[PDB]
Design a protein around this ligand. Structure first.
Ligand SMILES: Cc1ncc(COP(=O)(O)O)c(CNOCC(=O)O)c1O
Ligand SMILES: Cc1ncc(COP(=O)(O)O)c(CNOCC(=O)O)c1O
Lengths: 430, 432
C-alpha cells in the first residue's frame, strides 16, 4: 500500500538524518567497491550503518549511536566483540608464529574437538568459509557417485556460489541443480522419482537460515534420508548455521544422520572458517596418501588463528552445556516475543530454533520460501528502522542470533522495543 | 627422464633417514590420522613418509617438534611474505582486536583496504574481497558467465585456480562443472585453433601470468597478446589469476607486461597473511555487484570484510610491501635465481630454476620449460631427493621445489641455499 510506502519513506529519511557520517562513508566507499559494498547482505537503503567500535554485546556507529548487537555476525559472532578467551587464543597463535607454512599440532587438536562434538562427522577437513565447505561437499558427492544432479530447495542458501534464496542465481556455480519446495513432502517425492537415478546429492539446511529461520519438519527430513539411501545419493546437511543448536547440532536433536555435514560461522572462534566432514569412507577419499586421492589444498585452511581460536571456542567457551543453555535461553526469548505479539493481536510472529529467530509479518504457517515471501515485506523494513531507533541492531531482514554476551537487560530492551513497535505502528498493523 | 631403481633406492634411504630424524612428527601424524583424512586438511602439505610438524617460528626461521631449525624459503606458498612474526602485522592485529571482532556491519577499514588495492593494481577500478583465491576465481567465473550468458571457459593444462578449479594434472573430477576447455600453456598456434573453435561461446579466458603450482613457468608475451586480442575479439572476459603473480611488481604482472585483463583475481600475502582473496577489474563489469542496482549480482560471505584481514591487509600494502618494496624484492629474487642457475651451468648440472622476481622452482631438465608437458617431463625423483637434501641442510622449501622469498630472507639464508645447492650437485653427482 501507499500508506506503508510513505511510512518507509519517512523511516528512511529519519535514518538518513540520524546518520550523516555513515552517509559520507558510503559516498566514499562507492569509489573503491561496487555500491560501496563487499558483502551484499550488509547493504540496505538508503545506505548501511558504518560501525566504529564494539565491546561485548555492544557497538557504536560512526555518528556515535550505541546499540546492542542482536545480529551476532549472522550467527558467527557467538562470542561478542571482545571475548577474553578468543583474545588469549589470538595472543597464543601470534606467539606460535604466523604463516608457518607447514603441518601444525593445533589443526589436529581442533579436528579432534570437531569430530568429538558432531555425531555423524567421523573425519573432517577445514575450509575458509561455509561457501567452500558446501562446494567441497558437492565436489565429493559428484566425484564419488559420477552423477550430475543436485536436489536443493528454494529459499536455501549455501554460500556465494550456491545461493537459492530467490531461486536460481545467475552467478551460481553451474551444478545441475533441481529446486524443490522446502517442507513439501509430496512435491519433493515427485522430484526424487524423476531425478533420483541421477542425483549425486541432496543438499539441505535443517532450518532455512538466510531464508527466514524456517525449521525443517520431521516428515520432510525423513523423506530426504530414506530417498537418498534408496537412490544412492549423498545426503548433505548444511549445518553452517544450525550446528550451534546443540553440542552435536541439529543431527543430535533429530536422530537423523547425513552422509556429509558442512560447518561454518562460530566454530573457528570468529576467525575465517568452514568445514566439511562426514562418514569415514567418504572422507578417506581425501587422504592424500591414497590411490587417486581427491585434491583439497587451500592457503588458509589450517591457519594458526582459526585452529587456535576454534579449539578454544569448542573446548573452553561454547561447550555442549553452553550450547544447551543458550538454546534454552533462546527458546524462552522467542516464546516471550511471540506471547507479546499474541497478547497484542499483532499480525507478526518469530520463527526459528534455539538462539536463532526471524520476524515474519504473518500469522499464517511459515513453512517454505513461498510463505516467507508472502508475509508483509514493508512492515519488515519498518521494523528494522524502529529497532535501530531503540538502540537494538538486528538484520535488515529481521533475523537475530543471540550471542553468549546477550544478557537480561538486552533481552528485556528487545521485548520492550517490540511492544513499542506494536503500539507506535498500530495504524499500519490493521 | 624416467624413473630408475637407483634413484628410488636413494629416495627410500632419504625417507628412512627423515623418519628416523623426526620421531615426534611421526607420532603426530598417527594421531592426526584419527580426525582428518590421512591426518591432512590441505593436500599440498602432505608428503611421504609424513610431513614435519613445526613447533614455532620467528622471522624467516622455524623449528619442528623434533628440535630442528630451518630457514623458511617456502613462505606459505607465497602468502608468507612477512615472516612468522612481523611487528607491523602484529600491530595491525592488536588494532583490530581493539576495534572489535565480528562487528556484523560495514566498517571504514574495508573501504580503506579497497582503496589501497585500487591504488596498487592498474587494471582494478573496483574490487570485492573474498576469503580465498579459490573464492576469488569462482566469483570471477561467476561474473563472466552471468554477464556474457555463455558457458565455455578456456583455461590451461598445468593451471591452478583453487580447490574447485584445479588443472595442475588436467581435469580434476572434483572441479566445479564449468564447461572448461584446456589449452597448452604458451602454445600460440594450438590456442589460436581452440579459440577459433570455441571463441563464440567463450565466457572467459582464465590464465595465470606465470604457472604457480604448475612450476613457476613464465607466460611468454606472444601467448598473452593472443589471449588479450582474442578475448576482445570474441567478447570473452580475460581473467588474469594474479593470486601468486601480483607480488612481482607494484602493479603485478599486468604492470610489467603493459597488458590489462578485464578481471584480476588476488590472494596470498595481500591480506597481511590473514585469510584473503579478491576479485576486481573494469568498472563497468564490477558495477554489476552494486546492491542498489535492479538485478544486482549477489555476493555475501561471512568473513569477506572481517576486521583482521581489512586491518593487516591495509598495513601490508601501505606500510610494509610498498610498490618500491615489490620492485626491490623482485630484483633481489632475480639476482638469486640467476646465481642458482649460474651454479647449475658451471657444474654442468641437468637442472635449472624457473620463475620471476622472488618466485622460483627447480626442474631437473636441460630443456626450455614452457608448458606443463615440460614440467612433467623433468626428473621427478631427483626433485624428491632435492627436497630431503635441503631439509638436512636446514633449508625448508616446497616438496615440489618451489621457493617464495619473504621480506625476512637475508644474505645468510640466500648464501646457505646456494651452498646447499652446490653440496647437492657434488653429493649426488652419480645420479646426475
Ligand atoms: C546455511 C549456510 N550455508 C552456507 C553459508 C555460507 O557461509 P560463508 O558466508 O562463510 O561462505 C551461510 C551463511 N552465509 O552468510 C553470508 C554472510 O554473512 O555474508 C549459511 O547460512
Ligand atoms: C595461482 C593461484 N590461484 C588460486 C589459488 C587458490 O588460492 P587459495 O588457496 O587461497 O584458495 C592459488 C594457490 N592455492 O594455494 C594452495 C595452498 O597453498 O594450499 C594459486 O596459486
Amino acid at each position: 500500500t501507499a500508506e506503508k510506502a510513505q511510512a518507509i519513506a519517512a523511516a528512511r529519511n529519519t535514518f538518513a538524518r540520524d546518520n550523516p557520517v555513515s552517509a559520507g562513508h558510503h559516498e566514499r566507499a562507492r569509489r573503491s567497491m561496487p555500491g560501496g559494498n563487499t558483502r551484499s547482505i550488509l547493504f540496505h537503503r538508503p545506505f548501511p550503518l558504518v560501525i566504529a567500535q564494539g565491546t561485548g554485546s555492544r557497538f557504536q556507529d560512526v555518528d556515535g549511536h550505541a546499540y546492542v548487537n542482536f545480529l551476532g555476525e549472522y550467527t558467527a559472532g557467538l562470542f561478542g566483540h571482545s571475548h577474553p578467551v578468543i583474545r588469549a587464543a589470538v595472543e597464543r597463535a601470534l606467539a606460535v608464529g604466523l604463516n608457518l607454512s607447514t603441518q601444525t599440532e593445533n589443526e589436529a587438536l581442533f579436528a579432534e574437538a570437531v569430530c568429538d562434538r558432531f555425531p555423524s562427522i567421523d573425519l573432517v577437513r577445514f575450509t575458509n568459509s561455509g561457501t567452500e565447505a558446501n562446494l567441497m561437499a558437492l565436489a565429493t558427492a559428484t566425484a564419488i557417485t559420477g552423477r550430475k544432479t543436485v536436489l536443493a530447495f528454494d529459499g536455501g542458501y549455501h554460500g556465494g556460489l550456491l545461493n537459492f534464496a530467490s531461486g536460481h542465481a545467475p552467478t551460481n556455480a553451474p551444478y545441475h541443480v533441481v529446486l524443490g519446495v522446502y517442507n513439501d513432502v509430496e512435491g519433493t517425492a515427485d522430484l526424487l522419482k524423476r531425478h533420483g537415478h541421477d542425483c549425486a546429492a541432496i543438499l539441505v539446511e535443517p532450518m532455512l537460515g538466510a531464508g527466514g529461520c524456517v525449521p525443517a519438519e520431521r516428515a520432510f527430513l525423513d523423506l530426504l534420508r530414506a530417498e537418498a539411501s534408496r537412490c544412492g545419493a549423498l545426503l548433505i546437511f548444511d549445518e553452517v548455521m544450525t550446528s550451534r543448536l546443540s553440542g552435536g547440532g541439529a543431527q543430535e536433536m533429530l536422530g537423523i544422520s547425513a552422509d556429509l555435514t558442512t560447518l561454518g560461522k562460530y566454530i573457528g572462534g570468529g576467525m575465517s572458517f568452514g568445514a566439511f566432514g562426514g562418514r569415514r569412507d567418504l572422507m578417506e577419499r581425501f587422504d592424500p596418501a591414497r590411490d587417486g586421492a581427491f585434491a583439497h589444498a587451500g592457503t588458509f585452511n589450517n591457519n594458526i588463528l582459526t585452529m587456535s581460536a576454534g579449539h578454544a571456542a569448542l573446548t573452553q567457551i561454547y561447550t555442549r552445556q553452553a550450547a544447551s543453555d543458550l538454546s534454552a535461553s533462546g527458546d524462552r526469548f522467542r516464546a516471550n516475543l511471540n506471547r507479546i505479539a499474541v497478547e497484542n493481536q499483532a499480525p507478526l510472529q518469530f520463527t526459528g530454533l534455539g538462539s536463532l529467530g526471524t520476524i515474519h509479518f504473518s500469522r499464517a504457517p511459515i513453512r517454505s520460501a513461498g510463505d516467507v515471501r508472502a508475509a508483509d515485506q514493508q512492515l519488515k523494513e519498518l521494523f528494522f528502522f524502529h529497532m535501530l531507533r531503540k538502540g537494538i541492531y538486528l538484520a535488515p531482514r529481521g533475523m537475530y542470533a543471540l550471542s553468549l554476551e546477550i544478557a537480561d537487560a538486552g533481552r528485556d530492551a528487545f521485548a520492550e522495543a517490540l511492544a513499542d513497535f506494536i503500539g507506535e505502528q498500530r495504524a499500519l498493523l490493521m
